[PDB]
RNA sequence: GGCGGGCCUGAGGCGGCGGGGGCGACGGGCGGAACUUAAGCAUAUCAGUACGCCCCGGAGGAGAAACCAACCGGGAUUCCCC
RNA sequence: CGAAGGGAGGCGCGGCCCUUCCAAGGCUAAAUACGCCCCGGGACCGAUAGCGGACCAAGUAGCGCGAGCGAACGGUGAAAA
């Protein structure tokens, strides 16, 4: 999720933020962009069962 | 009885008569083709220590490996990166030219399983070795309880993936117990299986 | 263009013959709300090939 | 250290487990149709003149192991007795 | 004429041919390239004819729904252990066997044994004699009461004719280009 | 249609090696697969030694 | 996975339901010093066990009692504690050549 | 010398039957990196990884000891716990 | 370069034992793994979220010579009345 596309920090001279960006230039593969990836994904590694003597 | 004899023969292959027999062959080997059918095994008693019966279905094809040290097909020579992965001639095949000949043959007829191989002559130049390969779908062969595993579709193309006995040798598999504890289901599959992390419901 | 190959033509043919709008009776019949066909094409502003 | 110490080992009674000519024939008339490989007539030469260590010299280099060499040092010494 | 570039096959067995005269065959080898001769060939090969077993038709009527007569017995296998076992009284041998390491002992061990041995001509003839395409060998093992002094005859002549002893000493192998 | 393949199906019924249209269905792995004749076929050594110790039923106490 | 492998024996078991899931299988000590005054399941009955109580290979595997060819005695008392096995095994089993319904299949290790 | 056969090695054609190509997984065979970690960096690590190529199957591979051990010994393989 | 009885016992070599096995041929089920696809469940997401894609026509419209890139857009009402 967030992380199928293809994108790209546009640099550091277009008076741009350094985000990473896509062809059109459209904000991706971060938290604080739309359609971006989670900053930290859940994941199932989790442990969902404790322990009980 | 006779069997005995010729395997006894063969253990004396630098003798005065069988140097003639082999520099006769390998004369004749060298003018022929790199894959070639042969009516018939040259060698009758390692052919049949391997399998080979003389029914229908059975075939014999030499294939011819050339003799060497292998250069890795890098532009230049040039293997750009860190430098312990820099060097291209002198490297070493991973598989015997044992190996290399049977697999040489299952592209060359991908409609034959191959069963096992047999070294058959050298010269500095090339090495032959006699593939014995099995049809799969003639009549004998499959109402044969003997081979008929080879039909199986199971044993399709095994030389492609290591089955036949020189990739098996190829593979680690001819050694058992310690020194091949890391190579049993697969040298890939151990390292997996290894480097797995359980992460149990109750951990 | 006006030299081309059977087969370049009959694509172009498919392309010029699908170049058509919803017909009001299927917009009727699908109670569809979208008229517009949004596959339409216009030699000006498109490039097929 | 291989072993564990016990000096009362055997508490129990152990099962203990007890130990072709025509293979020779063959080699017979094999041996009358091939001969001796090169390497083998060098140290049937040897073994008539330079000696011993020469000869166990040259096979344990031709054959690899010193068990095998001093075999062969030893099976070729019957014909070279005979030179 | 004789200038023509002949298929690659045909000139790779003439050329075979060539150098098996130009090397230096090995003796126990040469002893294939010197068979027996021919007037004695055919004597065996009459002989044998009056043995022999069923033939392709005889056993095709002999399949349909329906003794030991002495047939001479024919291939390696069987053929060494009568050899060994003593029971042959003559072996014959065929002058080419595509792998020769199936046969090159066999003069050995016939000598070593006392059954007399004879290298003949083509194994195609030796099959024609057992019913079979071809064979590497046949061998007499009893012989009939009225044909054993045929066959003391023939017995005689091979030994008149093989020298185990001379052609394990031969090395005949090559000849010179001009010597034609 | 029918008539012409029913008949011919017909024709060819009862022949070695009958049209390919009119051979039944199967798979290509199917088609290419052992009959269970000949997968369950063992030397005769083998099956000497099932029928000197066939299967049993037995109940453990 | 629980579930499924329970499936499974119970379908096997319903498959051949006199006989019981598992076969019989020999004591044996467990190995180095650790562990040698404990003794465990092991394979098979080695074929000097077999001849103690009178059975051939064949005959002994056809009675559900596994055979390890490869396993050698080791021990005097080894063979003694094994043939009694098989001895209190062949009380316990009954061969049948309606009673089969009323057999009950034994459940889990033979002996245990 | 030239003409027939047998054998042996080939050559063209015809019949029957097979092969080829597909699937973002799992599986087998190979070829094979570097970013990275070492607070630099060459051995090392990443990694026997990405990726490239070849080959199956419903699983595959492995498999009935030229095994481990050192015992009051075990006993083909695969898998899990440690 | 090349054996004959040979292999192994986790420090090489030479000797002598011991324990343990038969390489250089072949087959084999089960337990094990896993996507597409179907089935079911969820302390999951709730339209800038959740797959890129909930919307009659999404890998679509569009863009790039090409390899390839790739959107946006849910909701009238009880009934279209």
Redesign the pocket.
Same mark, same amino acid.
């Given at each position: $999720?967030?992380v199928?596309?293809?994108?790209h920090s546009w640099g550091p001279g277009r008076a741009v933020a350094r985000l990473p960006r896509? /062809?059109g230039g459209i904000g991706?593969y971060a938290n604080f962009a739309?359609?971006?990836h989670?900053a930290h994904p859940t994941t199932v590694i989790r442990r969902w069962c404790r322990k009980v003597n | 009885g006779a069997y005995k004899y010729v395997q006894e023969l063969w +253990?004396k292959k630098?003798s005065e008569a069988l140097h003639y027999l082999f520099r006769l062959r390998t004369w004749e080997y060298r003018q022929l083709n790199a894959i070639? +059918?042969?009516?018939?095994p040259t060698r009758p008693e390692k052919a049949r &220590?391997?399998?080979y019966k003389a029914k229908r279905g059975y075939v014999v094809y030499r294939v011819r490996v050339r003799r060497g040290g292998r250069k890795?097909q890098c532009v230049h020579g040039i293997?750009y990166?860190? %430098?312990?992965?820099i060097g291209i001639v002198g490297?070493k095949?991973?598989?015997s030219l044992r190996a290399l000949a049977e697999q040489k043959v299952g592209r060359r007829l991908?409609?034959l399983r191959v069963?096992?191989s047999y070294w058959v002559a050298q010269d500095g130049s090339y090495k032959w070795y006699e593939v014995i390969l099995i049809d799969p779908?003639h009549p004998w062969i499959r109402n044969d309880p003997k081979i008929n595993?080879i039909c199986?579709?199971?044993?399709?193309? +095994?030389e492609?993936?290591?089955?036949?006995?020189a990739?098996?040798k190829?593979?680690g598999? !001819?050694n058992?117990? #310690?020194?091949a504890m890391?190579?049993? %289901?697969?040298?890939?599959?151990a390292?997996?299986?290894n /480097?797995?992390r359980?992460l *149990?419901r109750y951990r | 263009t006006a030299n081309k190959t059977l087969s370049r033509k009959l694509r172009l043919a498919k392309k010029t013959k699908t170049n058509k709008n919803?017909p009001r009776w299927?917009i009727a019949k699908?109670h569809? =709300?979208?008229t517009?066909?949004?596959?339409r !094409?216009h030699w000006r *502003?498109? !490039?097929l090939k | 250290p291989?072993?564990?110490f016990?000096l009362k080992?055997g508490?129990?009674v152990?099962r #203990?487990?007890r130990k072709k000519p025509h293979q020779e024939f063959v080699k017979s008339i094999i041996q009358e149709c091939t001969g001796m490989?090169?390497?083998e007539m060098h140290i049937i030469e040897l073994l008539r003149m330079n000696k011993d260590r020469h000869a166990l010299r040259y096979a344990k =280099?031709?054959?690899?192991? #010193?068990?095998?060499a001093? $075999?062969?040092r030893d099976?070729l010494s019957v014909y070279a007795r005979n030179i | 004429t004789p200038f023509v570039r002949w %298929?690659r096959?045909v000139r790779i067995?003439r050329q075979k041919a060539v150098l098996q005269r130009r090397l230096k065959v090995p003796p126990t080898v040469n002893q294939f390239m010197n068979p027996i001769s021919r007037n004695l060939t055919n004597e065996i090969f009459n002989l044998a004819r009056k043995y022999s077993p069923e033939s392709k038709e005889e056993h095709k009527a002999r399949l349909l729904q329906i003794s030991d007569k002495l047939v001479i017995a024919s291939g390696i296998r069987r053929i060494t252990s009568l050899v060994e076992s003593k029971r042959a009284k003559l072996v014959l041998i065929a002058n080419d066997v595509?792998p020769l390491e199936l046969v090159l002992w066999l003069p050995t061990l016939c000598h070593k044994m006392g059954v007399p041995y004879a290298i003949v001509r083509?194994?195609?003839?030796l099959?024609?004699l057992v019913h079979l395409?071809?064979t590497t060998s046949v061998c007499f093992t009893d012989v009939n009461p009225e044909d054993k002094p045929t066959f003391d005859k023939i017995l005689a002549a091979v030994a008149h004719e093989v020298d185990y002893a001379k052609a394990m000493k031969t090395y005949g192998g090559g000849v010179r280009r001009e010597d034609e | 249609n029918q008539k012409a393949r029913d008949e011919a199906r017909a024709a060819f019924e009862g022949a070695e !090696?009958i049209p390919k249209t009119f051979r039944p269905r199967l798979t290509?792995?199917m088609?290419?697969q052992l009959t269970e004749k000949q997968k369950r076929l063992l030397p005769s050594k083998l099956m000497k030694r099932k029928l000197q110790f066939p299967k049993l039923k037995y109940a453990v106490k | *996975?629980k579930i499924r *492998?329970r499936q499974?024996r119970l379908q096997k078991a319903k498959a051949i339901f006199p006989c019981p899931l598992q076969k019989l299988r020999?004591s044996?000590?467990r190995?180095?010093?650790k562990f040698?005054?404990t003794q465990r399941i092991?394979?098979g009955f080695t074929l000097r066990e077999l001849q103690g109580v009178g059975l051939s290979a064949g005959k002994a595997r056809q009675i559900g009692i596994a055979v390890?060819p &490869? &396993?050698?005695n080791?021990?005097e008392?080894?063979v003694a504690r094994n043939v009694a096995r098989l001895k209190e095994y062949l009380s316990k089993v009954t061969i049948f050549s309606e009673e089969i319904q009323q057999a009950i299949q034994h459940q889990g290790v033979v002996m245990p």
């Amino acid at each position: $999720a967030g992380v199928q596309c293809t994108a790209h920090s546009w640099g550091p001279g277009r008076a741009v933020a350094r985000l990473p960006r896509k /062809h059109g230039g459209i904000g991706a593969y971060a938290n604080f962009a739309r359609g971006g990836h989670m900053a930290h994904p859940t994941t199932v590694i989790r442990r969902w069962c404790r322990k009980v003597n | 009885g006779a069997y005995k004899y010729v395997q006894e023969l063969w +253990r004396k292959k630098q003798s005065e008569a069988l140097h003639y027999l082999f520099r006769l062959r390998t004369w004749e080997y060298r003018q022929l083709n790199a894959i070639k +059918r042969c009516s018939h095994p040259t060698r009758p008693e390692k052919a049949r &220590r391997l399998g080979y019966k003389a029914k229908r279905g059975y075939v014999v094809y030499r294939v011819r490996v050339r003799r060497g040290g292998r250069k890795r097909q890098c532009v230049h020579g040039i293997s750009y990166g860190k %430098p312990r992965n820099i060097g291209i001639v002198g490297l070493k095949p991973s598989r015997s030219l044992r190996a290399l000949a049977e697999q040489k043959v299952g592209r060359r007829l991908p409609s034959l399983r191959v069963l096992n191989s047999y070294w058959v002559a050298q010269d500095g130049s090339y090495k032959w070795y006699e593939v014995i390969l099995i049809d799969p779908f003639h009549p004998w062969i499959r109402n044969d309880p003997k081979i008929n595993w080879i039909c199986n579709p199971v044993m399709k193309r +095994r030389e492609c993936r290591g089955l036949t006995s020189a990739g098996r040798k190829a593979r680690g598999l !001819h050694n058992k117990g #310690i020194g091949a504890m890391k190579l049993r %289901p697969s040298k890939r599959a151990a390292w997996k299986r290894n /480097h797995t992390r359980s992460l *149990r419901r109750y951990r | 263009t006006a030299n081309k190959t059977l087969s370049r033509k009959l694509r172009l043919a498919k392309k010029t013959k699908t170049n058509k709008n919803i017909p009001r009776w299927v917009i009727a019949k699908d109670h569809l =709300k979208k008229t517009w066909n949004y596959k339409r !094409h216009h030699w000006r *502003r498109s !490039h097929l090939k | 250290p291989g072993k564990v110490f016990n000096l009362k080992k055997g508490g129990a009674v152990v099962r #203990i487990v007890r130990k072709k000519p025509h293979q020779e024939f063959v080699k017979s008339i094999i041996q009358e149709c091939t001969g001796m490989a090169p390497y083998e007539m060098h140290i049937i030469e040897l073994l008539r003149m330079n000696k011993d260590r020469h000869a166990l010299r040259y096979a344990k =280099k031709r054959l690899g192991n #010193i068990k095998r060499a001093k $075999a062969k040092r030893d099976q070729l010494s019957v014909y070279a007795r005979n030179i | 004429t004789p200038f023509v570039r002949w %298929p690659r096959q045909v000139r790779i067995q003439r050329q075979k041919a060539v150098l098996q005269r130009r090397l230096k065959v090995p003796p126990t080898v040469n002893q294939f390239m010197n068979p027996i001769s021919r007037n004695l060939t055919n004597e065996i090969f009459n002989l044998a004819r009056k043995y022999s077993p069923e033939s392709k038709e005889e056993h095709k009527a002999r399949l349909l729904q329906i003794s030991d007569k002495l047939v001479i017995a024919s291939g390696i296998r069987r053929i060494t252990s009568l050899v060994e076992s003593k029971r042959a009284k003559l072996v014959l041998i065929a002058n080419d066997v595509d792998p020769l390491e199936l046969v090159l002992w066999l003069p050995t061990l016939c000598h070593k044994m006392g059954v007399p041995y004879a290298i003949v001509r083509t194994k195609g003839d030796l099959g024609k004699l057992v019913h079979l395409k071809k064979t590497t060998s046949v061998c007499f093992t009893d012989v009939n009461p009225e044909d054993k002094p045929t066959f003391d005859k023939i017995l005689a002549a091979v030994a008149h004719e093989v020298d185990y002893a001379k052609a394990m000493k031969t090395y005949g192998g090559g000849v010179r280009r001009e010597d034609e | 249609n029918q008539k012409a393949r029913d008949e011919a199906r017909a024709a060819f019924e009862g022949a070695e !090696h009958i049209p390919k249209t009119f051979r039944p269905r199967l798979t290509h792995a199917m088609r290419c697969q052992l009959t269970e004749k000949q997968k369950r076929l063992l030397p005769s050594k083998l099956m000497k030694r099932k029928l000197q110790f066939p299967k049993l039923k037995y109940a453990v106490k | *996975r629980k579930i499924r *492998r329970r499936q499974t024996r119970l379908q096997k078991a319903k498959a051949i339901f006199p006989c019981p899931l598992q076969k019989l299988r020999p004591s044996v000590t467990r190995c180095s010093q650790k562990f040698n005054l404990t003794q465990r399941i092991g394979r098979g009955f080695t074929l000097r066990e077999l001849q103690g109580v009178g059975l051939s290979a064949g005959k002994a595997r056809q009675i559900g009692i596994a055979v390890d060819p &490869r &396993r050698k005695n080791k021990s005097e008392e080894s063979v003694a504690r094994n043939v009694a096995r098989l001895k209190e095994y062949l009380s316990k089993v009954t061969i049948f050549s309606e009673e089969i319904q009323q057999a009950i299949q034994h459940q889990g290790v033979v002996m245990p």
